[PDB]
Design a protein around this motif. Sequence first.
Motif, PDB file in Angstrom:
ATOM      1  N   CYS A 175       0.838  -1.188   0.000  1.00  0.00           N
ATOM      2  CA  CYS A 175       0.000   0.000   0.000  1.00  0.00           C
ATOM      3  C   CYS A 175       0.878   1.243   0.000  1.00  0.00           C
ATOM      4  N   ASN A 176       0.313   2.350  -0.483  1.00  0.00           N
ATOM      5  CA  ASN A 176       1.060   3.596  -0.590  1.00  0.00           C
ATOM      6  C   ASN A 176       1.299   4.263   0.759  1.00  0.00           C
ATOM      7  N   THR A 177       0.686   3.769   1.830  1.00  0.00           N
ATOM      8  CA  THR A 177       0.825   4.402   3.131  1.00  0.00           C
ATOM      9  C   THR A 177       2.029   3.841   3.886  1.00  0.00           C
ATOM     10  N   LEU A 178       2.498   4.620   4.858  1.00  0.00           N
ATOM     11  CA  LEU A 178       3.565   4.209   5.759  1.00  0.00           C
ATOM     12  C   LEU A 178       3.031   3.625   7.061  1.00  0.00           C
ATOM     13  N   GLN A 179       1.716   3.540   7.211  1.00  0.00           N
ATOM     14  CA  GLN A 179       1.134   2.997   8.432  1.00  0.00           C
ATOM     15  C   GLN A 179       1.466   1.514   8.551  1.00  0.00           C
ATOM     16  N   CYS A 206       4.596  13.188   6.821  1.00  0.00           N
ATOM     17  CA  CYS A 206       3.258  12.739   6.477  1.00  0.00           C
ATOM     18  C   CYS A 206       3.178  11.225   6.605  1.00  0.00           C
ATOM     19  N   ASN A 207       1.960  10.724   6.807  1.00  0.00           N
ATOM     20  CA  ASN A 207       1.751   9.295   7.002  1.00  0.00           C
ATOM     21  C   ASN A 207       1.908   8.493   5.717  1.00  0.00           C
ATOM     22  N   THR A 208       2.038   9.148   4.568  1.00  0.00           N
ATOM     23  CA  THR A 208       2.127   8.436   3.305  1.00  0.00           C
ATOM     24  C   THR A 208       3.578   8.095   2.971  1.00  0.00           C
ATOM     25  N   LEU A 209       3.737   7.100   2.100  1.00  0.00           N
ATOM     26  CA  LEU A 209       5.036   6.707   1.574  1.00  0.00           C
ATOM     27  C   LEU A 209       5.343   7.366   0.235  1.00  0.00           C
ATOM     28  N   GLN A 210       4.444   8.203  -0.267  1.00  0.00           N
ATOM     29  CA  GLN A 210       4.667   8.865  -1.546  1.00  0.00           C
ATOM     30  C   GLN A 210       5.834   9.839  -1.430  1.00  0.00           C
TER      31      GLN A 210
END
Lengths: 42, 42
Positions: free
Chosen positions: A38-42, B38-42
């Motif tokens: 998934c694109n998130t780092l969570q 930010c919480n995203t990996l983008q």
Amino acid sequence: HSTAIGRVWLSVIFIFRIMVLVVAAESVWGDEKSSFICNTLQ
Amino acid sequence: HSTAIGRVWLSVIFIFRIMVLVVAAESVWGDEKSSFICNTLQ
């Protein structure tokens, strides 16, 4: 005791499903979750 | 030429803003963007 439509055709189609499933089980769906990112780092 | 309300009070408040801004510039807002994650990996 079965008729021709199920003795031959149904059995062959069932074998076809068996062979296709065996081919697609370890190969296609082998990395279904490991490579599911998934694109998130969570 | 200025009156008392601006000669003393306005100047002191301006100095107060200068000192507060200097204190809060490098310290509070020093890491405003470096630590902005930010919480995203983008």
